[PDB]
């Protein structure tokens with residue numbers, strides 16, 4: 001049984017590294033300790049950051065949207081490496097990605113976060129939590145919930161090898177609305193779940209029930225996504241540019 | 246065979262099942278016996294329309310409000326039963342009293358909807374200790390803003406019920422729900438996490454022993470916690486609406502305190 005499961009873990013890790021330029025390993029090393037990021041903590045510091053790397057709040061949001069569009073393509077490439085995924089119904093592949101990317105983006109953003117701020121543009125920059133919190137409403141409440149989640153998620157001390165499998169688990173979620181053929185999606189998720197469980201037992205033998213703790217984080221994660229979507233609708237209150245986004 | 250660690254986990258499972266049976270008068274076992282017709286003596290009266298609802302009160306508001314307040318009062322009762330169960334969970338009553346309150350505050354509705362699934366099939370739900378069965382379509386026919394409030398619970402139940410869990414499983418799962426270290430405003434997280442660790446280990450073993458052919462049932466069960474949270478959040482949203490449109494509908498203060506700043 002375990003031959004396939006070790007193959008799956010390694011394959012997903014290799015694909016994860018190929019698809020995502022800034023890994024957690026590289027992010028934690030930047031956030032702790034040889035070249036340091038430019039820190040954006042202030043309106044004046046943001047201004048210099050742009051010369052180095054409408055109004056301030058809007059342009060940060062637009063910056064976030066640009067990155068998110070990039071991440072959607074990274075995630076999609078990654079998904080296509082997950083054994084079985086490309087053999088699913090094409091509408092189902094689109095549905096899984098459509099409803100999965102937000103969950104994945106905030107999961108992976110935790111890798112770039114500590115309790116005080118978030119790495120930006122390939123780790124070249126670091127924007128503080130308090131500066132993001134200071135932005136005028138409704139932009140000030142945009143990132144805070146993601147920081148609160150990240151603190152709780154990061155306490156699990158997952159590495160890139162664990163996260164590669166967890167992200168795959170998220171993508172293969174059989175409860176997405178409008179799926180045509182749930183069976184093979186659940187069947188693949190079952191195999192990914194088995195692989196994640198073994199990976200956490202081998203990689204973190206002294207962390208009791210880490211597998212269970214990790215799956216429980218989906219509860220807060222989906223809640224975060226639902227609140228975020230609602231805030232995106234509130235924010236909706238060059239034509240080609242709006243099309244891209 | 247077994248070892249001392251898994252032996253302790255078995256005793257914990259047995260203790261929790263025992264307390265569950267003592268705390269909850271209507272078990273899944275009894276609910277399924279009523280629903281599936283293991284019955285000449287246990288058959289429910291079925292409410293599927295106004296007249297059958299009238300006739301059923303032989304075995305003082307308008308109908309939608311009366312039904313909605315029925316759910317409220319039943320919820321109030323459930324909170325009592327769940328609080329009694331919680332006290333049996335080893336370590337729970339030794340926690341900081343404020344954390345006891347917080348865990349119940351955030352846990353009780355998730356437990357209520359979990360256990361409500363036991364009383365449900367795709368066509369309706371048992372009421373009045375199993376003596377009645379109200380149809381899903383009758384519930385969906387109630388006037389705005391009440392016609393939609395049970396649908397999310399039925400959709401969840403049908404998916405939840407496909408896991409085919411029994412009371413012995415549920416007993417440990419609901420303990421896991423209560424002992425969550427990620428509830429907002431908890432003072433001392435570590436003691437709570439340590440208890441949950443133990444409960445998770447016990448649930449995992451229980452599911453392995455009770456459902457040996459059911460692959461990754463533990464994981465799939467844990468994944469359903471996200472569904473529960475979504476039911477709670479959506480219901481709160483619906484209550485806000487109901488309250489504004491029906492300025493004459495009351496909300497029991499126990500429930501109102503549970504929902505306050507949730």
Ligand SMILES: O=C1NC(=O)[C@H](Cc2ccc3cc(OCc4ccccc4F)ccc3c2)S1
Nearest residue numbers: 312315316317319320361370371372379484500
């Ligand atoms: O605003 C609220 N806050 C809460 O805590 C409550 C949550 C809630 C909702 C529905 C329920 C249905 C139940 O059985 C079925 C049932 C019972 C009587 C009448 C009709 C029924 F269909 C049992 C408990 C229930 C609890 S209502």
